[PDB]
Amino acid sequence: MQDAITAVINSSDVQGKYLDGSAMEKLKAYFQTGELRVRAATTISANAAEIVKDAVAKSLLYSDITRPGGNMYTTRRYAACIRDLDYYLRYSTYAMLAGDPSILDERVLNGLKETYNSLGVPVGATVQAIQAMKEVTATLVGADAGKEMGVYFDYICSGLS
Amino acid sequence: MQDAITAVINSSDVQGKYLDGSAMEKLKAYFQTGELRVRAATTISANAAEIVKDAVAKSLLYSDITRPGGNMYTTRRYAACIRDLDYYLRYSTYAMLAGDPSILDERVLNGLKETYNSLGVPVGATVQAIQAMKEVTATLVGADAGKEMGVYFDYICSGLS
Amino acid sequence: MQDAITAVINSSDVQGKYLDGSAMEKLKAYFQTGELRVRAATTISANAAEIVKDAVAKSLLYSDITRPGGNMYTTRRYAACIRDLDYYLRYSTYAMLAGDPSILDERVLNGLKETYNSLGVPVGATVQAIQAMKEVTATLVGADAGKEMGVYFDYICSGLS
Amino acid sequence: SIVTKSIVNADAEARYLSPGELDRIKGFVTSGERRLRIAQVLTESRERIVKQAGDQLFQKRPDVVSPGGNAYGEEMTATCLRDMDYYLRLITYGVVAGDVTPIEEIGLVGVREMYNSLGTPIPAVAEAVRCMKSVASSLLSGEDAAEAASYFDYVVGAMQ
Amino acid sequence: SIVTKSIVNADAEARYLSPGELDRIKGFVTSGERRLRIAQVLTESRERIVKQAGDQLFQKRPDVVSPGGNAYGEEMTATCLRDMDYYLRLITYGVVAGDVTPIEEIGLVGVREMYNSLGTPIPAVAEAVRCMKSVASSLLSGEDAAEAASYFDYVVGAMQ
Amino acid sequence: SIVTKSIVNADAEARYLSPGELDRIKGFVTSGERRLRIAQVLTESRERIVKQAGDQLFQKRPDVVSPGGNAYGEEMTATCLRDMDYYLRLITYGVVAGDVTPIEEIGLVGVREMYNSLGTPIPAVAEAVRCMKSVASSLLSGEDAAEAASYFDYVVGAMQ
Ligand SMILES: *[C@H](C)[C@H]1/C(=C/c2[nH]c(/C=C3N=C(/C=C4\NC(=O)C(CC)=C4C)C(C)=C\3CCC(=O)O)c(CCC(=O)O)c2C)NC(=O)[C@@H]1C
Ligand SMILES: *[C@H](C)[C@H]1/C(=C/c2[nH]c(/C=C3N=C(/C=C4\NC(=O)C(CC)=C4C)C(C)=C\3CCC(=O)O)c(CCC(=O)O)c2C)NC(=O)[C@@H]1C
Ligand SMILES: *[C@H](C)[C@H]1/C(=C/c2[nH]c(/C=C3N=C(/C=C4\NC(=O)C(CC)=C4C)C(C)=C\3CCC(=O)O)c(CCC(=O)O)c2C)NC(=O)[C@@H]1C
Ligand SMILES: *[C@H](C)[C@H]1/C(=C/c2[nH]c(/C=C3N=C(/C=C4\NC(=O)C(CC)=C4C)C(C)=C\3CCC(=O)O)c(CCC(=O)O)c2C)NC(=O)[C@@H]1C
Ligand SMILES: *[C@H](C)[C@H]1/C(=C/c2[nH]c(/C=C3N=C(/C=C4\NC(=O)C(CC)=C4C)C(C)=C\3CCC(=O)O)c(CCC(=O)O)c2C)NC(=O)[C@@H]1C
Ligand SMILES: *[C@H](C)[C@H]1/C(=C/c2[nH]c(/C=C3N=C(/C=C4\NC(=O)C(CC)=C4C)C(C)=C\3CCC(=O)O)c(CCC(=O)O)c2C)NC(=O)[C@@H]1C
């Protein structure tokens, strides 16, 4: 994976260049966002269970999904599903700290879409849940952090389609 | 895998229903066939070597298959082939006891057709052998059990094409 | 893998035939080339580092390949590349001793082309290097051995396209 | 079912079933009639079993149906009873199959993660099963009640 | 061949062949002429070797050619001799290659499963090879007979 | 960066970052300004650092620039200096990132195999880095020189 710093490095390395004004300015941008990123990560860590609890209630419960014949039916599949949500939240949080989505491509999205098709996991429904988690998270961490977290929730969704 | 009982359960579970008249009747059907299934399995276990021996003599020997250039040529390939036949007989016997073919899909047929193509295993010839084993088995276990065993021998053949 | 001897055997075995005049003559051909093969293998073993060193200087260095953005850029990729060359040289040498290329198909070329595409390894450039190594080797081991080594260098190249 | 389980064992040892496995299956299909009757009673009286057990449950655990409780109000109480009906259903599955496996695979694997998430008090759910066990047992012979007991108990002891 | 075997060794250790391996191959191709001559004799006299060995075999083991035996009757006796010819052939393969590997890969791997299935008495097959060894050896020098002995013996000791 | 490294750790333990990891990152972005300034100085004076270090290097190691040496002649000397500039560049990468990882991944992994192949004397390359360290350090405060020292030293101690 990359974070915002090492990404800039590889961009300058690929060109065999020292860090110029633009590169230095991007690094500065990132450092200045540093503390807000940590603070938001602390908040999300602290409510991780409830964020997923709210996101599930809001988008999945009392539907066909959770009834006999739905993909969330049987306790094993219910657990699997909210386990996926913990994943998406935790890696979204990583990506947010890092200020770069490469960890999502690397450890979350790789062959995920194909897996979901294979088992019958409803992608559209999954995405509704993530988008719900985005709103719940935003409410919790504020507008600025919520926007940034949103970048990565969205990144995940796009990878699923 | 499923057996005849757990298959019925999943059918009723998928619908979120208790066991109704049809479901109960299928379970009854299965229990009533129970002892005949065990008896036939005891007989097949007891002659497993000779069933394959007869099936091979009847359908494969003294042909191009067993001569230099055939797929049964070299002792390693001869052993491989009759080893496949022991497999088909033993799992057919499982499926018969279970009154359900899901074990064939699960542990026998998965990627089998592709494997056989890959190594040059003659599928048509393989199927002749299995169909021969069916006749040999039928002779041995009687008409009713032979019919049932036949269900699974056939199931395997269909999976090979 | 096969060597020149076991290849002839399998050809006669496939036909269920004893070794006839042609088969015996091929075996003889091989034995008579035996010592020249060992001698050339001793020479190549003895200069293996310099052969690759020369082949690299001749075909890859001071180009875009070794500059920032090239596939040989970063010391890890430079090492990887000349490591590939050691491989091609060592297996070419095996194939030469064996008087048969089956080891190249078996342990070198299997899924290689697909791998190279996957990582971005330049195939054309790789082949230039191997063809350079051929010339360097030829210079070193003489015309006859060089021709034979050439058979296998070429075999590798063809497998890459 | 012992039929699946035996087959799985035999397969992992690359062999036909053992004479004992075969005999085991023989005694299993023999008892098929009896277990079907037990499931049938529980099926037929499901509405009573779940209603009465629910009433007993809410006596033992008024907290869950009082404000602040996971089953507070008509809709949440109804969902609770809905869940109880789920487990009575699964238990009838287990009874015909001869073991607790369909209960496990449908209703216990990850049950902790599900109910934790929802904030449902899991010990109160265990208690609800006890209550159903109590009501169910009375509609059965001493023999059948004993046999059915092991299915209810397993659910209760696995509600963790 | 020692050539393949050396290469396989060297490859597993990510290295060129050792001076000893190389020297080994050198002595191997040097003896190529001699081993070819030995295979050539066995090739040329194959029909005699298999016929006489078959006759000796059926003296030592009349059970296999009497009623109830695996080689009873003209056709089964002919198939038996057919098999013997198979193994004489494989042995000539081994001789030119310098080791028993082509014998193993073509005719010994799973030979037990094949012959058990057919109900062919495997010790009688071993005996048949002994018989071919006996006949073959007489057509060779003391030197060549000794060298060829190891191939026949290996087949006999691996007939299990 | 400690940010990547922390994340990788946390991920391998299936957890969010620890309060300490988080605090570590907080102190890391806090020192961002300082490390950027250090990289900026080395960037700005790169041509001097590499030229003077090259001159000092060729004093300590005249063999590399005399006949028979790996950097003999204008073009080879220029390639040597080219390489030195490479490593100064990588070092500025490491400085902003807070650790030696970009140096490792770009310029040390397999560096031995590369330079051995080329016949470049690796200890003389280490010395060249020492020389750049010397020149670079003088353009920095005692504080910044100390901090930058660890990056140069790591390269030198990893030049094996
Ligand atoms: C929940 C919102 C939705 C849902 C989920 C669901 N997923 C599965 C199965 C899998 N999910 C994953 C996904 C990941 N695994 C990982 O390790 C990571 C990153 C660390 C991700 C993103 C995988 C690999 C599987 C298969 C393996 C497994 O079981 O864990 C299921 C169960 C499928 C089954 O039938 O077994 C479910 C139910 N389903 C929904 O209905 C929601 C919309
Ligand atoms: C015999 C009637 C025919 C025949 C068979 C043959 N098969 C192989 C190779 C394989 N067969 C299998 C099949 C299975 N493996 C399993 O584990 C199971 C279920 C438990 C099945 C159904 C597989 C996986 C292989 C490849 C791996 C292996 O060698 O075991 C061969 C040998 C192929 C080779 O060249 O090595 C042969 C000869 N061939 C015939 O001619 C008959 C018609
Ligand atoms: C060098 C002339 C060219 C070049 C090579 C290059 N290759 C890789 C990566 C791999 N190369 C191989 C090839 C083999 N591996 C084997 O084990 C064998 C036989 C024993 C062969 C032929 C493989 C498998 C890889 C991937 C795994 C690995 O890294 O070793 C790279 C690095 C790719 C990367 O980005 O990591 C390079 C640079 N590249 C060139 O530019 C030359 C033309
Ligand atoms: C009743 C004794 C206790 C209780 C129950 C309760 N449950 C819920 C919500 C749900 N329960 C389930 C249950 C299952 N899903 C399955 O697949 C299986 C296995 C067959 C079971 C048992 C599910 C999926 C839900 C979510 C709602 C839905 O159907 O989508 C509630 C409501 C919780 C809420 O806040 O909505 C309640 C009240 N609660 C208690 O306190 C009793 C101890
Ligand atoms: C003779 C000394 C003994 C004997 C032999 C016997 N064999 C068979 C039948 C077969 N034998 C083979 C043998 C091989 N197949 C191979 O690929 C190899 C390696 C090269 C060998 C050695 C095969 C394939 C058969 C089946 C027939 C066929 O060719 O398809 C028989 C006939 C058995 C029958 O009942 O038909 C006999 C008699 N039997 C003895 O008793 C002697 C000790
Ligand atoms: C200078 C202090 C020493 C020295 C250097 C020297 N190097 C070369 C040739 C090359 N050096 C590289 C270096 C790198 N490639 C990378 O990707 C990285 C990491 C960023 C490094 C450091 C490469 C690729 C070459 C090959 C030439 C090319 O660019 O393609 C030479 C020339 C060798 C020759 O014979 O051509 C020299 C002289 N030599 C010394 O003696 C000094 C001690």
PDB file of C-alpha atoms in Angstrom, chain F residues 19-137:
ATOM      1  CA  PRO F  19      -3.759   4.782  21.060  1.00  0.00           C
ATOM      2  CA  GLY F  20       0.047   4.696  20.918  1.00  0.00           C
ATOM      3  CA  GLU F  21       0.167   4.130  17.178  1.00  0.00           C
ATOM      4  CA  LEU F  22      -2.269   7.015  16.737  1.00  0.00           C
ATOM      5  CA  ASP F  23      -0.187   9.241  19.015  1.00  0.00           C
ATOM      6  CA  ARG F  24       2.919   8.186  17.106  1.00  0.00           C
ATOM      7  CA  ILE F  25       1.365   9.318  13.830  1.00  0.00           C
ATOM      8  CA  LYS F  26       0.339  12.585  15.563  1.00  0.00           C
ATOM      9  CA  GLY F  27       3.944  13.335  16.501  1.00  0.00           C
ATOM     10  CA  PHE F  28       4.986  12.296  13.024  1.00  0.00           C
ATOM     11  CA  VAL F  29       2.873  14.861  11.153  1.00  0.00           C
ATOM     12  CA  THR F  30       3.902  17.428  13.760  1.00  0.00           C
ATOM     13  CA  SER F  31       7.555  16.991  12.753  1.00  0.00           C
ATOM     14  CA  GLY F  32       6.619  17.145   9.059  1.00  0.00           C
ATOM     15  CA  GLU F  33       7.673  20.772   8.674  1.00  0.00           C
ATOM     16  CA  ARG F  34      11.147  20.137  10.087  1.00  0.00           C
ATOM     17  CA  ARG F  35      11.882  17.090   7.909  1.00  0.00           C
ATOM     18  CA  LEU F  36      10.604  18.894   4.802  1.00  0.00           C
ATOM     19  CA  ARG F  37      13.092  21.742   5.462  1.00  0.00           C
ATOM     20  CA  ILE F  38      15.957  19.238   5.763  1.00  0.00           C
ATOM     21  CA  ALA F  39      15.024  17.526   2.486  1.00  0.00           C
ATOM     22  CA  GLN F  40      14.682  20.958   0.864  1.00  0.00           C
ATOM     23  CA  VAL F  41      18.235  21.981   1.730  1.00  0.00           C
ATOM     24  CA  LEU F  42      19.640  18.709   0.355  1.00  0.00           C
ATOM     25  CA  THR F  43      17.511  19.112  -2.763  1.00  0.00           C
ATOM     26  CA  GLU F  44      18.654  22.707  -3.341  1.00  0.00           C
ATOM     27  CA  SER F  45      22.356  21.953  -2.884  1.00  0.00           C
ATOM     28  CA  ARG F  46      22.348  18.521  -4.584  1.00  0.00           C
ATOM     29  CA  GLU F  47      24.789  19.522  -7.358  1.00  0.00           C
ATOM     30  CA  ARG F  48      27.346  20.760  -4.812  1.00  0.00           C
ATOM     31  CA  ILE F  49      26.941  17.822  -2.453  1.00  0.00           C
ATOM     32  CA  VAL F  50      27.494  15.325  -5.247  1.00  0.00           C
ATOM     33  CA  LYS F  51      30.383  17.233  -6.892  1.00  0.00           C
ATOM     34  CA  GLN F  52      32.373  17.814  -3.697  1.00  0.00           C
ATOM     35  CA  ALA F  53      31.669  14.363  -2.334  1.00  0.00           C
ATOM     36  CA  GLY F  54      32.810  12.916  -5.647  1.00  0.00           C
ATOM     37  CA  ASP F  55      36.083  14.853  -5.386  1.00  0.00           C
ATOM     38  CA  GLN F  56      36.664  13.703  -1.810  1.00  0.00           C
ATOM     39  CA  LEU F  57      35.750  10.165  -2.876  1.00  0.00           C
ATOM     40  CA  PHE F  58      38.292  10.068  -5.668  1.00  0.00           C
ATOM     41  CA  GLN F  59      40.957  11.271  -3.222  1.00  0.00           C
ATOM     42  CA  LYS F  60      40.228   8.429  -0.826  1.00  0.00           C
ATOM     43  CA  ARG F  61      39.864   5.906  -3.656  1.00  0.00           C
ATOM     44  CA  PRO F  62      42.002   6.876  -6.638  1.00  0.00           C
ATOM     45  CA  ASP F  63      41.967   3.241  -7.785  1.00  0.00           C
ATOM     46  CA  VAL F  64      38.362   3.537  -9.036  1.00  0.00           C
ATOM     47  CA  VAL F  65      39.297   6.486 -11.328  1.00  0.00           C
ATOM     48  CA  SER F  66      42.704   5.179 -12.450  1.00  0.00           C
ATOM     49  CA  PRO F  67      43.110   2.661 -15.323  1.00  0.00           C
ATOM     50  CA  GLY F  68      41.575  -0.682 -14.392  1.00  0.00           C
ATOM     51  CA  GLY F  69      39.031   1.004 -12.126  1.00  0.00           C
ATOM     52  CA  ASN F  70      35.264   0.787 -12.461  1.00  0.00           C
ATOM     53  CA  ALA F  71      34.923   4.575 -12.883  1.00  0.00           C
ATOM     54  CA  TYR F  72      37.878   5.109 -15.237  1.00  0.00           C
ATOM     55  CA  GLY F  73      37.452   7.965 -17.712  1.00  0.00           C
ATOM     56  CA  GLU F  74      34.995  10.831 -18.149  1.00  0.00           C
ATOM     57  CA  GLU F  75      31.911   8.759 -18.964  1.00  0.00           C
ATOM     58  CA  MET F  76      32.360   6.221 -16.168  1.00  0.00           C
ATOM     59  CA  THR F  77      33.189   8.948 -13.682  1.00  0.00           C
ATOM     60  CA  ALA F  78      30.024  10.740 -14.764  1.00  0.00           C
ATOM     61  CA  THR F  79      27.963   7.539 -14.295  1.00  0.00           C
ATOM     62  CA  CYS F  80      29.469   7.164 -10.821  1.00  0.00           C
ATOM     63  CA  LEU F  81      28.433  10.712  -9.893  1.00  0.00           C
ATOM     64  CA  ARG F  82      25.078   9.922 -11.502  1.00  0.00           C
ATOM     65  CA  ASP F  83      24.708   7.056  -9.026  1.00  0.00           C
ATOM     66  CA  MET F  84      25.694   9.270  -6.115  1.00  0.00           C
ATOM     67  CA  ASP F  85      23.030  11.745  -7.152  1.00  0.00           C
ATOM     68  CA  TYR F  86      20.578   8.819  -7.205  1.00  0.00           C
ATOM     69  CA  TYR F  87      21.309   8.042  -3.563  1.00  0.00           C
ATOM     70  CA  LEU F  88      21.197  11.673  -2.422  1.00  0.00           C
ATOM     71  CA  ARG F  89      17.783  11.799  -4.072  1.00  0.00           C
ATOM     72  CA  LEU F  90      16.570   8.634  -2.317  1.00  0.00           C
ATOM     73  CA  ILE F  91      17.824   9.998   0.975  1.00  0.00           C
ATOM     74  CA  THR F  92      15.610  13.111   0.629  1.00  0.00           C
ATOM     75  CA  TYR F  93      12.721  10.688   0.059  1.00  0.00           C
ATOM     76  CA  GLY F  94      13.522   8.917   3.301  1.00  0.00           C
ATOM     77  CA  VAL F  95      13.799  12.174   5.200  1.00  0.00           C
ATOM     78  CA  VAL F  96      10.257  13.363   4.375  1.00  0.00           C
ATOM     79  CA  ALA F  97       8.842   9.873   5.044  1.00  0.00           C
ATOM     80  CA  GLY F  98      10.559   9.646   8.427  1.00  0.00           C
ATOM     81  CA  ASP F  99      12.349   6.337   7.791  1.00  0.00           C
ATOM     82  CA  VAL F 100      14.715   4.492   5.462  1.00  0.00           C
ATOM     83  CA  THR F 101      12.049   2.430   3.668  1.00  0.00           C
ATOM     84  CA  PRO F 102      11.947   4.332   0.355  1.00  0.00           C
ATOM     85  CA  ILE F 103      15.750   4.126   0.310  1.00  0.00           C
ATOM     86  CA  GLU F 104      15.566   0.342   0.807  1.00  0.00           C
ATOM     87  CA  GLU F 105      12.806  -0.313  -1.726  1.00  0.00           C
ATOM     88  CA  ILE F 106      14.282   1.855  -4.472  1.00  0.00           C
ATOM     89  CA  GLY F 107      18.039   1.517  -3.878  1.00  0.00           C
ATOM     90  CA  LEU F 108      19.190  -1.251  -1.525  1.00  0.00           C
ATOM     91  CA  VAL F 109      17.167  -4.377  -2.276  1.00  0.00           C
ATOM     92  CA  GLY F 110      19.462  -6.416  -4.497  1.00  0.00           C
ATOM     93  CA  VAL F 111      21.994  -3.591  -4.731  1.00  0.00           C
ATOM     94  CA  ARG F 112      24.737  -6.207  -4.131  1.00  0.00           C
ATOM     95  CA  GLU F 113      23.732  -8.311  -7.122  1.00  0.00           C
ATOM     96  CA  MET F 114      23.582  -5.219  -9.367  1.00  0.00           C
ATOM     97  CA  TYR F 115      26.979  -3.802  -8.415  1.00  0.00           C
ATOM     98  CA  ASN F 116      28.663  -7.222  -8.364  1.00  0.00           C
ATOM     99  CA  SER F 117      27.466  -7.825 -11.884  1.00  0.00           C
ATOM    100  CA  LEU F 118      28.823  -4.438 -12.982  1.00  0.00           C
ATOM    101  CA  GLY F 119      32.094  -5.043 -11.135  1.00  0.00           C
ATOM    102  CA  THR F 120      31.599  -1.847  -9.140  1.00  0.00           C
ATOM    103  CA  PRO F 121      33.498  -1.913  -5.828  1.00  0.00           C
ATOM    104  CA  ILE F 122      30.679  -1.735  -3.259  1.00  0.00           C
ATOM    105  CA  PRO F 123      32.828  -0.487  -0.339  1.00  0.00           C
ATOM    106  CA  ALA F 124      33.839   2.450  -2.536  1.00  0.00           C
ATOM    107  CA  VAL F 125      30.168   3.205  -3.047  1.00  0.00           C
ATOM    108  CA  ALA F 126      29.630   3.174   0.721  1.00  0.00           C
ATOM    109  CA  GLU F 127      32.542   5.565   1.019  1.00  0.00           C
ATOM    110  CA  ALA F 128      30.875   7.837  -1.569  1.00  0.00           C
ATOM    111  CA  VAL F 129      27.815   8.070   0.667  1.00  0.00           C
ATOM    112  CA  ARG F 130      30.021   8.897   3.649  1.00  0.00           C
ATOM    113  CA  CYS F 131      31.463  11.680   1.544  1.00  0.00           C
ATOM    114  CA  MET F 132      28.021  13.029   0.682  1.00  0.00           C
ATOM    115  CA  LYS F 133      27.064  12.784   4.361  1.00  0.00           C
ATOM    116  CA  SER F 134      30.091  14.912   5.236  1.00  0.00           C
ATOM    117  CA  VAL F 135      29.276  17.653   2.707  1.00  0.00           C
ATOM    118  CA  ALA F 136      25.535  17.567   3.390  1.00  0.00           C
ATOM    119  CA  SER F 137      25.939  17.805   7.179  1.00  0.00           C
TER     120      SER F 137
END
